[PDB]
Design an enzyme around this catalytic site. Structure first.
Site, PDB file in Angstrom:
ATOM      1  N   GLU A 234       0.821  -1.209   0.000  1.00  0.00           N
ATOM      2  CA  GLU A 234       0.000   0.000   0.000  1.00  0.00           C
ATOM      3  C   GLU A 234       0.866   1.276   0.000  1.00  0.00           C
ATOM      4  O   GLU A 234       1.972   1.304   0.586  1.00  0.00           O
ATOM      5  CB  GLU A 234      -0.989  -0.019   1.188  1.00  0.00           C
ATOM      6  CG  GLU A 234      -0.365  -0.003   2.600  1.00  0.00           C
ATOM      7  CD  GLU A 234       0.164   1.372   3.067  1.00  0.00           C
ATOM      8  OE1 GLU A 234       1.133   1.385   3.868  1.00  0.00           O
ATOM      9  OE2 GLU A 234      -0.360   2.433   2.662  1.00  0.00           O
TER      10      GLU A 234
ATOM     11  N   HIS B 135      -9.491   3.932   2.766  1.00  0.00           N
ATOM     12  CA  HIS B 135      -8.699   3.027   3.579  1.00  0.00           C
ATOM     13  C   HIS B 135      -9.137   1.593   3.436  1.00  0.00           C
ATOM     14  O   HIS B 135      -9.364   0.900   4.445  1.00  0.00           O
ATOM     15  CB  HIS B 135      -8.736   3.432   5.055  1.00  0.00           C
ATOM     16  CG  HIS B 135      -7.569   2.907   5.832  1.00  0.00           C
ATOM     17  ND1 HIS B 135      -7.644   1.795   6.639  1.00  0.00           N
ATOM     18  CD2 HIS B 135      -6.283   3.324   5.885  1.00  0.00           C
ATOM     19  CE1 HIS B 135      -6.458   1.571   7.182  1.00  0.00           C
ATOM     20  NE2 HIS B 135      -5.619   2.489   6.747  1.00  0.00           N
TER      21      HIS B 135
ATOM     22  N   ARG C   1      -5.475   5.701  -0.847  1.00  0.00           N
ATOM     23  CA  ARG C   1      -4.366   4.768  -1.071  1.00  0.00           C
ATOM     24  C   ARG C   1      -4.322   4.259  -2.514  1.00  0.00           C
ATOM     25  O   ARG C   1      -5.350   4.209  -3.203  1.00  0.00           O
ATOM     26  CB  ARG C   1      -4.493   3.556  -0.142  1.00  0.00           C
ATOM     27  CG  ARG C   1      -4.542   3.807   1.353  1.00  0.00           C
ATOM     28  CD  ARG C   1      -3.186   4.158   1.932  1.00  0.00           C
ATOM     29  NE  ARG C   1      -3.247   4.393   3.378  1.00  0.00           N
ATOM     30  CZ  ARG C   1      -3.595   5.535   3.984  1.00  0.00           C
ATOM     31  NH1 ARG C   1      -3.873   6.620   3.304  1.00  0.00           N
ATOM     32  NH2 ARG C   1      -3.640   5.594   5.305  1.00  0.00           N
TER      33      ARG C   1
ATOM     34  N   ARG D 199      -2.728  12.320   7.534  1.00  0.00           N
ATOM     35  CA  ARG D 199      -2.260  11.378   6.491  1.00  0.00           C
ATOM     36  C   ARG D 199      -3.422  10.946   5.578  1.00  0.00           C
ATOM     37  O   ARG D 199      -3.254  10.821   4.362  1.00  0.00           O
ATOM     38  CB  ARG D 199      -1.557  10.162   7.095  1.00  0.00           C
ATOM     39  CG  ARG D 199      -0.891   9.256   6.039  1.00  0.00           C
ATOM     40  CD  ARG D 199      -0.081   8.145   6.677  1.00  0.00           C
ATOM     41  NE  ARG D 199       0.130   7.040   5.740  1.00  0.00           N
ATOM     42  CZ  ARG D 199      -0.168   5.765   5.959  1.00  0.00           C
ATOM     43  NH1 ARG D 199      -0.649   5.361   7.119  1.00  0.00           N
ATOM     44  NH2 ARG D 199       0.061   4.874   5.001  1.00  0.00           N
TER      45      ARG D 199
END
Length: 92
Positions: free
Chosen positions: A53, A81, A66, A62
């Site tokens: 990832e 996520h 992804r 953050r």
């Protein structure tokens, strides 16, 4: 299967991540490149360590976005996520 999405349709930041991966970094986060275990079987099922990832930056801290890569160069988008995946079509 999963939905397909054109690489050029993804957020600018997702494309940035795609390019850093092609470049092998250096990456912005210490967790960039850790194994993704696909524990929910949302990606095709493979052996251990097949998926990794990478963070897609969120102008935000953050965040949830992804890219996941496979062992032969598969690329997948997840804004959430790993709740949902699209397979990134590098052809468009």
């Amino acid at each position: 299967a999963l939905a397909d999405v054109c690489r050029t349709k993804l957020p600018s930041q997702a494309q940035d991540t795609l390019a850093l991966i092609a470049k092998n970094g250096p990456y912005p986060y210490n967790r960039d490149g850790v194994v993704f275990e696909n524990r929910e079987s949302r990606l095709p099922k493979k052996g251990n360590g097949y998926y990794h990832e990478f963070t897609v930056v969120t102008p935000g801290d953050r965040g949830t976005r992804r890219v996941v890569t496979g062992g032969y160069g598969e690329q997948y988008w997840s804004p959430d996520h790993y709740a949902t995946f699209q397979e990134i079509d590098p052809r468009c």
